[PDB]
UniProtKB/Swiss-Prot annotation, chain C:
Main function: Essential cofactor of the RNA polymerase L that plays a central role in the transcription and replication by forming the polymerase complex with RNA polymerase L and recruiting L to the genomic N-RNA template for RNA synthesis. Also plays a central role in the encapsidation of nascent RNA chains by forming the encapsidation complex with the nucleocapsid protein N (N-P complex). Acts as a chaperone for newly synthesized free N protein, so-called N0, allowing encapsidation of nascent RNA chains during replication.
UniProt remark on domains: The N-terminus consists of a long intrinsically disordered tail. The central part contains the coiled-coil multimerization domain (PMD). Forms a four-stranded coiled coil structure. The C-terminus constitutes the alpha-helical domain that binds to the nucleocapsid (N-RNA complex).
Coiled-coil annotated residue ranges, if any: 22-48
Protein name: Phosphoprotein
Family statement: Belongs to the rubulavirus/avulavirus P protein family.
Residues of the full protein shown: 198 to 245 of 392
Domain of life where this protein originates: Viruses
Known partners and oligomeric status: Homotetramer. Interacts (via multimerization domain) with polymerase L; this interaction forms the polymerase L-P complex. Interacts (via N-terminus) with N0 (via Ncore); this interaction allows P to chaperon N0 to avoid N polymerization before encapsidation. Interacts (via C-terminus) with N-RNA template; this interaction positions the polymerase on the template for both transcription and replication.
Length: 74, 47, 48
């Protein structure tokens, strides 16, 4: 005689307990996707700040030009 | 015979599980992409 | 005959291939983890 659907029911409850954990990790990893996107946003912000850093380094090369000029005589 | 017509729910559920694996694939892909962005950023910083 | 191996092996192959697929996913995320360790070492350097 062929076996019965005890295989069905017990394995159903097992695979469902595991799949809800998969979906829980999916929830937290969508949250983690949003958080990583926010990290990317903040990093782009700090890189825009290093653009002001580029402006300031240009200011410093202008400043060294000016200091050389003024130092030329005294 | 058995009357267990309620297995189609679990079948489409394991199919949505396939979609869930492809969706965590999309997850790691978008994270890798934003990571490439920020690695170009940090390369600019180191330069 | 009772409910036969049609839906059974359908969902079985589904969950098995997609479990090895989850394995490949976590391998890709392991690549992600390594690359984020890299980026975080760089950011620790710049914070220092």
């Amino acid at each position: 005689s062929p076996l019965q659907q005890g295989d069905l029911n017990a394995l159903v409850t097992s695979v469902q307990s595991l799949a809800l954990n998969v979906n829980e990790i999916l929830n937290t990893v969508r949250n983690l996707d949003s958080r990583m996107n926010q990290l990317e946003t903040k990093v782009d912000r700090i890189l825009s700040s290093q653009s002001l850093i580029q402006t300031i380094k240009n200011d410093i090369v202008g400043l060294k030009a000016g200091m050389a000029t003024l130092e030329g005589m005294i």
